Write a protein that binds this ligand. Structure first.
Ligand SMILES: Nc1nc2c(ncn2[C@@H]2O[C@H](COP(=O)(O)OP(=O)(O)OP(=O)(O)O)[C@@H](O)[C@H]2O)c(=O)[nH]1
Length: 252
């Protein structure tokens, strides 16, 4: 067909099989989730969007899935990120120093995937799904991430870390999942400090991006929630990752 209904990419190929396999694999590796029934997880995931209009998804839709994917996360080792998820994941992979959303069962199930159904048919739409700007923000994928991110942020305590992409326009972007949901759902009773690591992209020698206006905005927002803010530059992420693997080392 030469023109699609929505402006976004459509459901990821073999979505149901992909999601089921991820659930099997996650529940094999992580013993606290050893017991989860993956068919049921898939059935609750499907329940959230199938047969529903994909511009009319609500956080309620995902509550069955949220219950099934209930999980403890070490609250003081949370790493949040904005537009730099590969480095976040490479870092937590070394020795599990922190945990991102994609280290939880639900974040691992959905990472990199797209999905949406059709009102009053039970088909998955593999041709297009709503684009958040053009069509609607209340679509299956957006609503999932807003729902699961808010719960993850509510679970954090003590010092929470966030990696931000210092190669971008808006280092802190108030429209991102981190800026629109997670910053506002950290609980000040529990969270002492949000520490941002601003990841440089920029050829070696660079500015102190902790002075960027958007980082000052983030400091202001966080400080006014009664949480302390700290920021550090990571000037050379490749050197950082190496120091994480081999800290005894080479000019770390
Ligand atoms: N793994 C993961 N994906 C997320 C998270 N929050 C949003 N996403 C998804 O990541 C993908 C890319 O989002 P972005 O790079 O921020 O680009 P964008 O925000 O969609 O820009 P627009 O298309 O104009 O809305 C989309 O599927 C998002 O829904 C999250 O916390 N973790």
């Amino acid at each position: 067909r030469w023109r699609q209904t929505w402006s976004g990419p459509g459901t990821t190929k073999r979505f149901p099989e992909t999601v089921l396999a991820r659930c099997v694999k996650y529940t094999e590796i992580h013993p606290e989730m050893r017991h989860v029934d993956c068919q049921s997880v898939w059935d609750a995931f499907k329940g959230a969007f199938i047969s529903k209009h994909p511009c009319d998804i609500t956080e309620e839709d995902y509550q069955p899935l949220m219950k099934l994917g209930t999980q403890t996360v070490p609250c003081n080792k949370i790493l949040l990120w904005s537009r730099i998820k590969d480095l976040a994941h490479q870092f937590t992979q070394v020795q599990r120093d922190m945990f991102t959303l994609e280290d939880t069962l639900l974040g691992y199930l959905a990472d990199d995937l797209t999905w949406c159904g059709e009102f009053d048919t039970s088909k998955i739409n593999y041709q297009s799904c709503p684009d958040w700007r053009k069509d609607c923000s209340n679509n299956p994928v957006s609503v999932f991430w807003k729902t699961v991110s808010r719960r993850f942020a509510e679970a954090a305590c003590d010092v929470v870390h966030v990696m931000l992409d210092g190669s971008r326009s808006k280092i802190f972007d108030k429209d991102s999942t981190f800026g629109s949901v997670e910053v506002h759902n950290l609980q000040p009773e529990k969270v002492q400090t949000l520490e941002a690591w601003v990841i440089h992209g920029g050829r070696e020698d660079s500015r102190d991006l902790c002075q960027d206006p958007t980082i000052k905005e983030l400091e202001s927002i966080i400080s006014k929630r009664n949480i302390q803010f700290s920021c550090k530059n990571i000037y050379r992420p490749d050197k950082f990752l190496q120091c994480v693997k081999n800290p005894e080392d080479s000019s770390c």
